[PDB]
From Swiss-Prot, chain A:
Residues of the full protein shown: 55 to 108 of 430
Role description: Microtubule inner protein (MIP) part of the dynein-decorated doublet microtubules (DMTs) in cilia and flagellar axoneme. Plays a key role in the assembly or attachment of the inner dynein arm to microtubules in sperm flagella and tracheal cilia. Forms filamentous polymers in the walls of ciliary and flagellar microtubules.
UniProt signal peptide: none
Designated name of the protein: Tektin-2
Tissue localization of expression: Expressed in the testes (at protein level).
Family: Belongs to the tektin family.
Gene designation per UniProt: Tekt2
Residue stretches spanning the membrane: none
Modification(s) after translation: Ubiquitinated, leading to its degradation. Deubiquitinated by USP16, promoting its stability.
Subcellular location: Cytoplasm, Cytoskeleton, Cilium axoneme; Cytoplasm, Cytoskeleton, Flagellum axoneme; Cytoplasm, Cytoskeleton, Microtubule organizing center
From Swiss-Prot, chain B:
Entry protein name: Tektin bundle-interacting protein 1
Quaternary structure note: Microtubule inner protein component of sperm flagellar doublet microtubules.
Compartments, record wording: Cytoplasm, Cytoskeleton, Cilium axoneme; Cytoplasm, Cytoskeleton, Flagellum axoneme
Task performed by this protein: Microtubule inner protein (MIP) part of the dynein-decorated doublet microtubules (DMTs) in cilia axoneme, which is required for motile cilia beating. Located at the center of the tektin bundle where may function to recruit tektins or stabilize the bundle.
Span of the entire protein shown here: 156 to 187 of 206
Length: 54, 32
């Protein structure tokens, strides 16, 4: 009896941990997207700056 | 094929592409 109880507890623990894992996965990919976007914005502002000369 | 994939192991180091499906929170419409 007690053996099987401990087994089920280990199961639920692994479950919650992987829940955290997936959530953080999506967050990090979204951060990747945002960093790309800000890169493009930086360049665009920079070209306008350079066109401010003539 | 098109069949059940577990969208779980999903950290490609740099997928800054028209890819990385499901949730992205990218922008929908862009400059023009």
């Amino acid at each position: 009896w007690d053996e099987h109880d401990n087994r089920t507890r280990l199961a639920e623990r692994i479950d919650t941990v992987n829940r955290w894992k997936e959530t953080l996965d999506k967050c990090l990919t979204d951060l990747d997207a945002e960093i790309d976007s800000l890169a493009q914005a930086k360049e665009s502002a920079e070209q306008n700056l350079q066109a401010k000369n003539l | 094929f098109g069949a059940k994939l577990p969208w779980r192991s999903d950290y490609v180091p740099l997928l800054s592409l028209p890819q990385r499906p499901r949730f992205t929170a990218q922008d929908f419409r862009q400059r023009g």
